[PDB]
Design an enzyme around this catalytic site. Structure first.
Site, PDB file in Angstrom:
ATOM      1  N   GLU A   1      -3.009   6.274  13.492  1.00 13.54           N
ATOM      2  CA  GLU A   1      -2.276   5.111  13.024  1.00 13.54           C
ATOM      3  C   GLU A   1      -1.165   4.809  14.024  1.00 13.54           C
ATOM      4  OE1 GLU A   1      -3.469   3.375  10.541  1.00 13.54           O
ATOM      5  OE2 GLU A   1      -1.867   1.888  10.432  1.00 13.54           O
ATOM      6  N   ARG A   2      -0.698   3.557  14.002  1.00 17.28           N
ATOM      7  CA  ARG A   2       0.411   3.106  14.835  1.00 17.28           C
ATOM      8  C   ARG A   2       1.636   3.991  14.660  1.00 17.28           C
ATOM      9  NH1 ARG A   2      -1.814  -2.085  14.096  1.00 17.28           N
ATOM     10  NH2 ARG A   2      -2.237  -1.252  12.008  1.00 17.28           N
TER      11      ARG A   2
ATOM     12  N   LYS B   1       0.826  -1.199   0.000  1.00 11.43           N
ATOM     13  CA  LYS B   1       0.000   0.000   0.000  1.00 11.43           C
ATOM     14  C   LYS B   1       0.864   1.253   0.000  1.00 11.43           C
ATOM     15  CE  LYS B   1      -2.059   1.132   3.814  1.00 11.43           C
ATOM     16  NZ  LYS B   1      -1.541   2.513   4.007  1.00 11.43           N
TER      17      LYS B   1
END
Lengths: 469, 71, 57, 470
Positions: free
Chosen positions: A190-191, A164
């Protein structure tokens, strides 16, 4: 005077009281800066976003950081405007948070830079674009099967392990190469280690000198993560309006935006609607995604990863995003393990743009014939499994011998993968990829070996890879 | 059968408290014969309507709901 | 008889392939029903929790 | 010192005291009221304090019905929680939630030692460092689901499975071989079954070992809340002074949670996940962390559980499966075969059955018995439909040894002597490990499928088979 005073603190929700007639408007920013005067108190720098008006001259806010240390009675400064985010050329190459402050160790932005408000009405009906233009990405499987729109919303359903981020970096590279277009990344919840991995990959790629990033990651309060896509989008809107150019805007996992707004609304005390979603689900998603349009001067096109909770498309958080999507690009793992890069699934990636009025007649006929041959070849897999490769017919053997050439031709050499495979990579225009798939479908390039078609740019240079072997 | 049985009725037109107190009235009529040494059979036709009548009975008295808004 | 045994085993092959495909499309419609009932269950439970909370305030 | 009643809404009662004289939480408040005219009802209540409100008022929980209460009755503050009699006085007696005898044997005098119900759990250094095994003498339990001495057990059984007979032989074997008193605490389950169980205590003659506490479904949820804790404070005397390995039977700990859910909505608390009270896990933990094995003593606990609609994802069975160590699953099919106790050998599990706890030989024998009974369970439809003469060899051997195994798991109880005549048996763990090892090796394949029914030891199999046949 606009000095405030804290009344209530309960988690992120902070109630602040001003004097009468000096109230802050909704969505304004409130700077709390406190130097601890003794050993009891704790130093605080903390910003609040006004969300309601409760009466009795008070104001209910939601917090952007942790509220630990806030004392009942301490001073709150009204900014007079919503969260002002720096835009301009000084944001290119820099990692930012939701408050427009640099996360990086490179430096601080000076105070005289232009800062524009975070909350803005969507561009009016007078100012939009009448026609639908095509967005030329230079990826073949995108520009042929799921074409993009200037001012579009595109869904990535890949996940991890399918490349991605490689598509993200190549779309940034190609648009900033050919269209002169700045990109903006915005990682909504997000992480943090994956945010650092994405920043180091875009630094190694060299794509970053042209993009701008915003990370309000998972450790931050819900009032931050609800407003992170807006401060990526406000950075994109400067290059749409003032510069007038075709801007990308990547929102990674916009389901984190929806559930961040959901938990903000649960903290604010609202009655939850269907499936636990905030009553204001569709209008918060509308206030995000109606600023992603193509106006008369430029455009903002958007590529948005979508979570698909408990993998049904009828849950309201996928369902209110899918009513804004103009295209989907499914990334499949079995095409990455096969050796086709990018791993875009050619049969599940759909587009609203793929129509003869928008794109054209020849592109449409070639693209639908490509989908027909790949559908027939996907049907023939069990027949090849139980009958073997021979004794099918002449016609479907020609279909397999045509469709595997088409299937391996969909892979490109990216400019991103040059530091990994040494191959220089290519931008393929849409007319030459339509001509290439047309000349494959006619049977003109049928006698060449199929490994010449892998990882090749256009149709004029598959002859040289067949010549080298 | 109506030389040894009693019938207690609590109609739908009757308000919710009379459907609430119908089984307790029936079992009080049963207890009178039970503590004398007789043998009683008491049939509560549709106790789920008693539960819905008591659910109405509580929700109108401003008691907080629980599962499926029963108290 | 060798012809008939070959057609027997091919007929049972095709019959079990059709039974597997019928079971799989039945699974698909049952998962649509499961997702509808799942969403309706969560919204029922959340409105009953919030109504029991609002009864006190 | 003196407080009056303000609100009565069902179970809860609000009492306002004079300033500076409020009772602390969990105290017992008493209302002794005599009717001043014919327009009033005589009242004897005990009120457990639950919350402190603002303006000197106190929200309490009634132990009995609040019918008859007048706004303005004076309430006596006792200054302590519900003091419950403990000692050798309580053995063979049946009690209320308030520690009063509901049988007609007599009153306990006022100078007897009474302990308060609410006390903290034993601390970290007071517990036992090793896992020890509570040896029961029941071969399904001793082999396939061992009981932790100090652990929490689940009985999953209805009626017809002999749950009362299994409870009685647990009480009998523990009070015979360990000297351990038992305590039955029946928490909100079927007054008819409580009376059946009390008359079977009287008939068995093992009652003089147990102490019984019944607060049934007929009582308000304050009594169903506090019955498990007053049975627990009767068992903690024997643990904390006599050093004994005490049993403690709670009949449906599920009722301990749903009586709290009935109470808490009236207390004024916001509702939780399944409609259960917010304080589900801490109330369940304050119950089931007092059931631990200390250095000098032990309380093991066999706890019946009625999972409502057999839905194990409900929050109250989840919260009480978080505390269990074993399950003893009584099945009706094994009772129809004649296998008493009807413990399902494959579904009943334990944390103990691991080779560092039970030993290595016991672990191999128990796992091989589980494997062959599972393989016989997989052949149930094949034998029942297709027939017996068609399976194979090395599977007819499996069902051959599996019949002898699943009949040898049954015992003759000491309790069933009054019904069958044979005097019963207590079987040590090493001897049942040796017996199941000898049946798995194939030493007893020439004996019939009878003479494994209802025998204690492994030599009693051949002492019965020489009496019947070969």
């Amino acid at each position: 005077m606009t000095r405030g005073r804290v009344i209530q603190v309960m988690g992120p929700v902070v109630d602040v009281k001003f004097e009468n007639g000096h109230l802050p408007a909704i969505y304004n920013a409130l700077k709390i800066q406190h130097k601890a005067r003794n050993e009891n108190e704790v130093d605080i720098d903390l910003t609040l976003e006004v969300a309601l008006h409760l009466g009795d001259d008070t104001v209910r806010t939601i917090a952007m950081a942790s509220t630990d240390g806030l004392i009942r009675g301490m001073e709150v400064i009204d900014t007079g405007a919503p969260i002002s985010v720096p835009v301009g050329e000084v944001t290119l190459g820099r990692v930012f948070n939701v408050l427009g402050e640099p996360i990086d160790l490179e430096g601080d932005i000076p105070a005289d830079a232009r800062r524009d408000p975070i909350h803005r009405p969507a561009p009016k009906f007078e100012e939009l674009a009448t026609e639908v233009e095509i967005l030329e990405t230079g990826i073949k499987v995108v520009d042929l099967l799921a074409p993009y729109i200037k001012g579009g919303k595109i869904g990535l359903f890949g996940g991890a392990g399918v490349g991605k981020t490689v598509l993200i970096q190549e779309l940034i590279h190609n648009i900033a190469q050919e269209h002169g277009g700045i990109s903006v990344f915005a990682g909504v919840g997000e992480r943090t280690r994956e945010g650092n991995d994405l920043y180091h990959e875009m630094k190694d790629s060299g794509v970053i000198s042209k993009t701008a990033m915003v990370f309000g990651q998972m450790n931050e309060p819900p009032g931050a993560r609800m407003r992170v896509a807006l401060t990526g989008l406000t950075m994109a809107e400067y290059f749409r309006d003032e510069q007038g150019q075709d801007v990308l805007l990547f929102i990674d996992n916009i389901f984190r935006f929806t559930q961040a707004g959901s938990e903000v609304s649960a903290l604010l005390g609202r009655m939850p609607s269907a499936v636990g979603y905030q009553p204001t689900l569709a209008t918060e998603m509308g206030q995000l995604q109606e600023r992603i349009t193509s106006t008369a001067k430029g455009s903002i096109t958007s590529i948005q990863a979508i979570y698909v909770p408990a993998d049904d498309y009828t849950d309201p958080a996928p369902a209110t995003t899918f009513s804004h999507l103009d295209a989907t690009t499914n990334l499949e793992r079995k095409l990455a393990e096969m050796g086709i890069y990018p791993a875009v699934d050619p049969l599940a990636s759909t587009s609203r743009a793929l129509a003869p009025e928008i794109v054209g007649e020849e592109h449409y006929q070639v693209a639908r014939k490509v989908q027909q041959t790949l559908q027939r070849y996907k049907e023939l897999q069990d027949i090849i499994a139980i009958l073997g490769m021979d004794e099918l017919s002449d016609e479907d053997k020609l279909v397999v011998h045509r469709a595997r050439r088409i299937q391996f031709f969909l892979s490109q050499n990216f400019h991103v993968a040059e530091q990994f495979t040494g191959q220089p990579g290519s931008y393929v225009p849409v007319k030459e990829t339509v001509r290439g798939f047309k000349e494959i479908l006619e049977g003109k390039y049928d006698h060449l070996p199929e490994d010449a078609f892998r990882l090749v740019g256009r149709i004029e240079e598959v002859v040289e890879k067949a010549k080298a072997m | 059968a109506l030389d040894y049985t009693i019938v207690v009725t609590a109609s739908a037109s009757q308000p919710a408290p009379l459907l609430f107190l119908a089984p307790y009235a029936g079992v009080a009529m049963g207890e009178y014969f039970m503590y004398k040494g007789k043998h009683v059979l008491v049939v509560y036709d549709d106790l789920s309507k008693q539960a819905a009548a008591y659910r109405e009975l509580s929700l109108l008295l401003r008691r907080p709901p629980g599962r499926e808004a029963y108290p | 008889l060798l012809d008939a045994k070959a057609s027997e085993h091919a007929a049972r092959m095709t019959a079990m392939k059709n039974a597997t495909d019928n079971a799989n499309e039945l699974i698909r419609t049952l998962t649509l029903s499961y997702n509808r009932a799942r969403q309706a269950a969560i919204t029922q439970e959340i409105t009953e929790i919030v109504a029991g909370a609002n009864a006190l305030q």
